[PDB]
Design a binder for this molecule. Structure first.
Ligand SMILES: [Mg+2]
Ligand SMILES: [Mg+2]
Ligand SMILES: [Mg+2]
Ligand SMILES: [Mg+2]
Lengths: 336, 336, 336, 336
């Protein structure tokens, strides 16, 4: 039994999540999943009703929860996601980039998984103005975090095509990246097909032939950049799912923001959200080993690819003229 | 006048460069260009003939020279280029990304100019191992280096589409990138169309629509990555020219390596090299204000564009079947 | 005309300052000094009446004042002195160490002046925990601050024995202290008797023979340590005066704390306070060049040495049995 | 048993050391000490005889040796001592300050033991010039190095007056020194009389009353300064012994240099050297747990104390008029 904290959020969050509960229920039924969805408030509407973005009562329900399933948050996204990440130590940021039929009309065979270290590097904020016009920032990279991220890489590789590529820039940064690349090797080498690529080359190679990649393990920054590039190649950044996995707690969300310009027009695309749910199921299979959840993930992911291939009910963002309701219905019919 | 240190280099360097002298000579007399070319030896071949990769007699000549024109260098590339860039303070790294009609693009017509700070950031190698398994790098951003790179960005924009985009990550690095962006504004705001974009957005927008970009001004690291992504999108990395511009010294080279595997087969593509020469002429114009150099620049760029459009004598790297002598000849007929 | 902001402070501050106004008035009279003493509240009693240690009304009266003359502050000393230093940029911390008759029974001829840089080094607080069990602190030293501190050194040397000693540790810290020692030389060398000493040697030399020193210019930390040592040798740390001089604003105070254990017993020693007033007068001679204030400084300083030599009315801290009132009276009689 | 690499060194080194072998030999047979002395060449004299200051044949022997006993080294001191201290991880720098009855003290009887961390802090030389006239040093404090130095502090305290004082500056450096002090507490609190003192207070209290101190545990830099202050107070820097203790290698030397000005006059004082030997025996006791070494230590310390008390055969550096042979002889008669 898993307990999932459901967050609607702002903008098109409420429309996307609330209308997706139909699919979330059809799957608990069809595959007999013991998932409890207890929803809580967080974001810009919670800051207006109460005084905090992450209300006291909400934090207490998330703490007793296994997984956090959220839609997009507004202006307060930084106080909700970041603070929630460092207290439940959700170090691994997973970013899949898979070709979607119809949207990728250039390659068609992209299947990348980017494992990105999300705790150190330059994104921890240790910077100062040391003198007039002079700013110094500290890049901190440890072998502890470097091995933990690698282990996650190994787990995803082992159930995919057994191929990992450690991406870095150790030719210039001998010490920092050199340490990251060494810890990469201690874990991966000899257990999977291993190779190393320089960050600039990988940025060029993603364009030339992204099918050469399976799993990519890289650092916080390099990963921030390569992820977005990869998603856009696979088709669209507005369709991209995201996850932040820790040892005892995980978080699944879409990459796209709250999108206030289209909020309420009933045309927001629920695809990113729904693919993050597919990952969430996959995470319930690593924690339970009960293949009951893996079946639900494949079923939801193939339902999505089928609607995109037919082109009969897509939202405006991807060239359709159907609503969010029509798209969800098409996925609900091909579910079983 | 101008004095140029010419370096043939290794692998395909000797073939490419020596055969391109015909072209370098025809232009000097066609546009009455006072350029003196004095070749020096450097690279792997010089390490085996003499004792050093960069002989004292070579350094003596490059010291009096205005511009450094070079072909690809072998294994000792990292000891030459980098050193010369530091002692002659060649801070601006120019990387154009321009599609050539003829070669496969699959992204449309792109005309992007990336201007990269090439002296500070994380690439100055200020990093150490502080404790067991703990490494620390220092990122340095200064007002000085940042205004200087923005001024170079302004020059190039002004004679292109007058559009600039500062790429950074000030949302997460408030102090370091924030100082970069502020320097970018005090120089560019008001003088050109100016916008700022986060590096991960840019990595993605470069794939979604690269035609939205004209001149990009960014940091050492971010520019290192985006440069290679932009060159692939436009065409190939083997067609890509490069430049390193200082106040009183400039260097022009192809991006491609020595390519020992095809050396001597007489098939190395001189395009990247000849486009470097074209950039050189562009820099001689800024220095002398004599538009003869700009006319020589357009004349050379044009000639290669015509031969590519005709597709009758291309090299095998771009789908042709002609020799490196045939392609140079076709550019020589389109010149006069 | 000078306007001095008078602060009583806590503990023995109120007793020391308020009873010293007799001497402060006798000198304005005897030497016709145009000094306006307008007193303001700051410290632990101000935090109890109002809500801030440095009340809004107080800050506004200090801003229109030239010099700040304070007694000791209590628990809130860090929010009063430090914040007041960095907004009026009072970089130079002056610490004289002069033998007092009767208390120095070991050397008898100590006359040191320590000029201590008070803005950079390690005392600016740029430190983080980068990893588990690992802490990093940044030592930042600029040539700007290094030359400003040296210039102050030169001014004090020029009206004393024309002898300066730059103290550092550049043999180990080639870059940081090496830069400090270079900036020391640019200013001092060729204008005064110049020499360099290593910090550990100076710590030993102060004990062996402190008469070898006149003025000492050193960095924030080394100076924090050497100052206290020097004062204790000269006689007593509880007798030591202190100053923080800036370009447009100065601050004079005793080194000793509020001393709550003896507060109200009418036995606190006013000597430290009164010698800081002697420095304050000296500072009015650098800003006015009117030797009227220099006369008042020598007169107050000799009045103090005379009472210490006679031993008839000293406070318990230095072996007497007289009160703070009796000591002030003896100085008031030998004033004129 | 123990094997000792003996190094005569330069200047007065050869005279002092060679004449002290008589003493080293008499003790080995008087207390049945299994110590093998194997002399190696190192210093300026070795740089002129052979080619290196620290010959390969010397390093070979020191590698198999347990303890390194050395006399003063000339100009090449910084290349030997420092290197050997880094590759054999000799982290604890012991600096006793003990008055000898006979020599001028002027501070009473002091018996201070300073234990200095000698591997991290600011002395690992992690500093760079980041911008024009701006230098940055990195101060590194670790939990590991700090507990290790506190354990060494505990050993020495336990066999002295069971009193320890952690010297630091955590009031201003909250993070760095704060971590040092915390490591100091978890090891010392409860096992000995434990207090903490700020470095500037200590510099002053060392002059006011040094008898309040027994064992001092501090950092690399603070201990560098206070060590020299404490040795002067106790007596002289030329009488001061020094030690550098690692887990599997230890080094013992005098603090004084080679003193070329008096070399050959047969007047160099062997006290510092012989007190180093005494410390060595103390370390052999901790390693073997055989009190024969401790008896040899007290026996040697005592003999020198008797000759100093009698004042009949002292060297000119301490007011005597005897030769370096006479003083060694008097210690040899007081031994048997
Ligand atoms: Mg993030
Ligand atoms: Mg480069
Ligand atoms: Mg201070
Ligand atoms: Mg040392």
């Amino acid at each position: 039994g898993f307990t999932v904290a459901l967050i609607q959020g702002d903008g098109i969050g409420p429309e996307i999540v609330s209308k997706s509960k139909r699919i979330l229920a059809k799957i608990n039924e069809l595959y007999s999943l013991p998932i409890e969805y207890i929803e809580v408030e967080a974001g810009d509407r919670a800051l207006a009703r109460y005084g905090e973005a992450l209300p006291k009562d909400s934090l207490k329900i998330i703490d007793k929860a296994d997984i956090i399933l959220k839609g997009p948050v507004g202006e307060s996204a930084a106080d909700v996601v970041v603070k929630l990440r460092q207290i439940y130590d959700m170090y691994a940021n997973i970013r899949p980039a898979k070709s979607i039929p119809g949207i990728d009309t250039k390659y068609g065979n992209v299947d990348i998984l980017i494992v990105r270290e999300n705790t150190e590097d330059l994104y921890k904020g240790f910077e100062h103005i040391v003198s007039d016009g002079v700013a110094v920032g500290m890049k901190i990279i440890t072998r502890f975090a470097s091995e933990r991220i690698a282990k996650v890489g190994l787990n995803f590789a082992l159930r995919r095509r057994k191929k990992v590529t450690c991406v870095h820039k150790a030719n210039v940064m001998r010490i920092t990246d050199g340490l990251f690349a060494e810890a990469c090797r201690s874990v991966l080498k000899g257990k999977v097909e291993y190779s190393e690529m320089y960050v600039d080359a990988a940025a060029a190679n993603l364009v030339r032939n992204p099918q050469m990649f399976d799993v990519i393990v890289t650092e916080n920054v390099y990963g921030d950049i390569l992820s977005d590039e990869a998603s856009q190649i696979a088709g669209s950044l507005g369709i991209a799912p995201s996850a932040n996995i820790g040892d005892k707690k995980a978080l699944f969300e879409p990459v796209h923001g709250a999108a206030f310009d289209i909020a309420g027009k009933n045309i927001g695309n629920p695809t990113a959200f729904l693919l993050s749910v597919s990952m969430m199921y996959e995470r319930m299979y690593e924690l339970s080993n009960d293949d009951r959840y893996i079946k639900a993930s494949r079923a939801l992911e193939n339902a999505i690819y089928l609607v995109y291939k037919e082109r009969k009910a897509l939202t405006p963002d991807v060239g359709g003229n159907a609503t969010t309701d029509d798209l969800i219905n098409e996925i609900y019919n091909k579910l079983g």
